Amino acid sequence: MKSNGCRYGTHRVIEPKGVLPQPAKILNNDMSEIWDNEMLIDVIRLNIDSASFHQIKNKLIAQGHQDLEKAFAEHAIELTNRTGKHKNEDTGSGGMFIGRVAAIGDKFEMKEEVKVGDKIASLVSLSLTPLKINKVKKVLLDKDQMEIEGQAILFSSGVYAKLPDDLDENLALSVLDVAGAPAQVERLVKPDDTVVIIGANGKSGILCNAVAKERAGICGKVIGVVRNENYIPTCKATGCDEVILAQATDAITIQKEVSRLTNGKMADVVINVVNTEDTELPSIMAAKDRGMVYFFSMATSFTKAALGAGGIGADVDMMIGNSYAHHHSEIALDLLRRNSVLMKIFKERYA
């Protein structure tokens, strides 16, 4: 065991020098001796990024490979052994792994309590994960996955979730996928708040509906916004008191309907969890003066939010929805355990 290791992982950066593992081109994936603050994993499955996976598979077909499953297998071994990680050299994507804990450093910053043998999922990108592929058992082209045998490093700054046996299935990775959303909502929503959730039928949306209603309480008002009227029962069943029918890009409609349902006082907290562009200005206009607008979605444009609010003189706070929060996986899993309505919907939708 080697001592004084960087939680950000610079001790495993080979090329170039003085950059973090993610921007690094070549990482040190030598799993024979670990650092004091690292944690080693016996990798079971690689969930590759769907655009990265699709991109590599096509490039192998354009070079005239016949056996795509082996060619992808061939591509993975060469990529990881040369660069130390499965960072797509063209798109710069990656993914996550599922494995079992293999060794734990003495000075490892423990987040979720795990021991050797625990089955954990990774919530950080493969583009920063030291990875060594010893064998490729299967290459599922339709599942963007690889059944392998290898090992990976989690730095002390890394993020992982302990996968439960009592919760079965891939219920958890669909939850870990959006676990940062409900954890953040419970920090934002006060008792008696009026909450507007735009994209209230989505994966993270319905989790936000439930947590928002729990926090705002009996005298709070949770208002969903959805594009399609077939979604109204689900929004109300997952916590919305009222539901608006509008395109998330329809700023004027959403404003008048929120104003009507709140007698012109508007929302204290607006949660945006749609996957569409040009919904920044509608989200801003649903909020009251000095209200909170929380952007969770990757379709959010920084510039449209920052300048949009200026043009209409909207003094509201606009926060970038962090993908991580302390205990966000435990909290999101707890939410499904406490909320039977959500649990069923998740098992039906993302089993």
Ligand X SMILES: NC(=O)c1ccc[n+]([C@@H]2O[C@H](COP(=O)([O-])OP(=O)(O)OC[C@H]3O[C@@H](n4cnc5c(N)ncnc54)[C@H](OP(=O)(O)O)[C@@H]3O)[C@@H](O)[C@H]2O)c1
- Site residues for ligand X per CB under 6 A: 177-178, 180, 199, 201-205, 226-228, 247-249, 273-276, 296-299, 306, 321, 323
Q: Which of its own copies, ligand X, none does residue 300 bind (CB under 5 to 8 Å by kind)?
A: its own copies
CB of 41 to its own copies, least distance (A): 16
Q: What angle do CA 227, 203, 278 make, to 5 degrees?
A: 45
- Which residue number, 205 or 239, has a Cβ lying nearer to its own copies? 205
- Which residue number, 158 or 205, has a Cβ lying nearer to ligand X? 205
Q: Which of its own copies, ligand X, none does residue 124 bind (CB under 5 to 8 Å by kind)?
A: its own copies
- Which residue number, 290 or 349, has a Cβ lying nearer to its own copies? 290
DSSP 239-272: T-SEEEE--TT-HHHHHHHHHHHTTT--EEEEEE
Strands 287-295 and 267-272 come out as parallel
CA pair distance 95, 128, nearest whole angstrom: 10
How many residues does the structure list for the chain? Answer: 351
CB of 35 to ligand X, least distance (A): 26
Run of H or E including 342: helix 340-349
- Which residue number, 21 or 199, has a Cβ lying nearer to ligand X? 199
Task: Tell me the three-class secondary structure of 32-49, residue by residue.
Answer: CCCECCCEEEEEEEEEEC
245 burial via Cβ count (<10 Å: 0-12, 13-18, 19+): middle
CB of 116 to its own copies, least distance (A): 21
Q: Which of its own copies, ligand X, none does residue 351 bind (CB under 5 to 8 Å by kind)?
A: none
Q: Which of its own copies, ligand X, none does residue 80 bind (CB under 5 to 8 Å by kind)?
A: none
φ, ψ for residue 206, nearest 5 deg? -70, -30
Q: How many CB atoms lie within 10 A of CB 65?
A: 15
CB of 123 to its own copies, least distance (A): 7
List b or e across 70-93, with b for residues whose CB sees 16 or more CB atoms inside 10 angstroms: ebbbebbbebbeebbbbbbeeeeb
CA torsion 45-334-39-9 (nearest 10°) is: 100
CB of 97 to ligand X, least distance (A): 15
Binding region for its own copies (CB under 8 A): 7-8, 10, 18-20, 22, 111, 123-125, 128, 157-159, 180, 250-253, 255, 281, 285, 295, 298, 300-303, 305-326
Q: Which of ligand X, its own copies, none does residue 342 bind (CB under 5 to 8 Å by kind)?
A: none
Longest dimension (CA), the chain: 65
- Which residue number, 167 or 299, has a Cβ lying nearer to its own copies? 299
- Which residue number, 216 or 309, has a Cβ lying nearer to its own copies? 309
CB of 132 to its own copies, least distance (A): 20
Q: Which of ligand X, its own copies, none does residue 141 bind (CB under 5 to 8 Å by kind)?
A: none
CA pair distance 211, 200, nearest whole angstrom: 12
- Which residue number, 1 or 252, has a Cβ lying nearer to its own copies? 252
Tokens of 74: 């061939």
Q: Which of ligand X, its own copies, none does residue 81 bind (CB under 5 to 8 Å by kind)?
A: none
